[PDB]
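Input.
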Amino acid sequence: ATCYCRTGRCATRESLSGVCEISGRLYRLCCR
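Output.
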């Protein structure tokens, strides 16, 4: 499905599914 790396909390229609990491900086992975 469709997953996004987000700096905020996942949309309520999305689930926290892991983290993204770029160059030491972390994001939530949020999948619909």
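The chain has one domain: 1-32.
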